[PDB]
Design a protein around this ligand. Structure first.
Ligand SMILES: Cc1cccc(C)c1-n1c(=O)c2cnc(Nc3ccc(N4CCN(C)CC4)cc3)nc2n2c3ccccc3nc12
Length: 271
């Protein structure tokens, strides 16, 4: 819909940027207030850094994917500089939070709770025929009440058939991406499942980089041998075996996110 009819378009005057949370090549992200009282996160595009159409596509997707377990789109300002306003998550990214004095004290019970919350959000994405493609602790935001939500749908895509085929040039994080995606550029919800497995290791190690002491080619070599990530220190065996399900060779053999949610919730109540 044109901006003058779009429910999400709001006057730039309604926003007050208060604190910068991040700055980069394509712009900045700020904590701010909408109409003085509502705390929000604001992403601003650096004119010239990238296509505005590219910048807003993420916001347009989020207009389509709304759920309690996914960071919510709040509004957009489609006049340069273009802004994307969203639901503010007080405790930032999960990978960072798990490293704070608070995150460090979390019991395995709360870690499993969070893991299930994440699988819950993905189950929704899975059900709506979407894929995330960038599922990792860095892309899970934490609230002031210690609840988690899926974020950054920049690579997210509606799946019309079964898979999405990236471009022969597209590049992705080796340690977090499923083999089929790394080798054929083919993504399915099953690829996200693999990423979830990796994310589970990030949770249990309180943010440690997956495959400790290994370079990307070492990782690929070991995977091809049938090996999987070595058991993280202090990782409950039940959880480890759940991770291994996420890492099965055949995409089709990996479980659904609803199954993962279900199991993790049982793990939670058991602890
Ligand atoms: C707005 C937006 C549009 C499209 C896609 C996404 C993912 C967002 N998007 C949010 O929803 C989004 C929602 N909540 C937060 N909270 C938050 C609080 C403290 C810190 N910290 C912790 C303390 N250090 C000091 C500062 C950073 C970091 C984050 N941050 C977001 N951020 C970002 C924060 C830093 C850098 C980039 C960011 N992009 C977003």
């Amino acid at each position: 819909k044109p901006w003058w009819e779009d429910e999400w378009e709001v006057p730039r005057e309604t926003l007050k940027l208060v604190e910068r949370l991040g700055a980069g090549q394509f712009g900045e992200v700020w904590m701010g207030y909408y109409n003085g009282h509502t705390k929000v996160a604001v992403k601003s595009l650096k004119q010239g850094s990238m296509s505005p159409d590219a910048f807003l596509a993420e916001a347009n997707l989020m207009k389509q994917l709304q759920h309690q377990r996914l960071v919510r789109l709040y509004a957009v300002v489609t006049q340069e500089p273009i802004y994307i306003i969203t639901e503010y998550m007080e405790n930032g990214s999960l990978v960072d939070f798990l490293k704070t004095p608070s995150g460090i004290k979390l019991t395995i019970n709360k870690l499993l709770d969070m893991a299930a919350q994440i699988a819950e959000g993905m189950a929704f994405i899975e059900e709506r025929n979407y894929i995330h493609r960038d599922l990792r602790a860095a892309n899970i935001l934490v609230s002031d009440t210690l609840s988690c939500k899926i974020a950054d749908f920049g690579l997210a895509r509606l799946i019309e058939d079964n898979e999405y085929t990236a471009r022969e040039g597209a590049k992705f994080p080796i340690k977090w991406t499923a083999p089929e995606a790394i080798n054929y550029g083919t993504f399915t919800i099953k690829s996200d499942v693999w990423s979830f497995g990796i994310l589970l290791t990030e949770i249990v190690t309180h943010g440690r980089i997956p495959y400790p002491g290994m370079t990307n080619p070492e990782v690929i070599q070991n995977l091809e041998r049938g090996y999987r990530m070595v058991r993280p220190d202090n990782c409950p065996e039940e959880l480890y075996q759940l991770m291994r399900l996420c890492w099965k060779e055949r995409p089709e053999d990996r479980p659904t996110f609803d199954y993962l949610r279900s199991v993790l919730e049982d793990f939670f109540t058991a602890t």
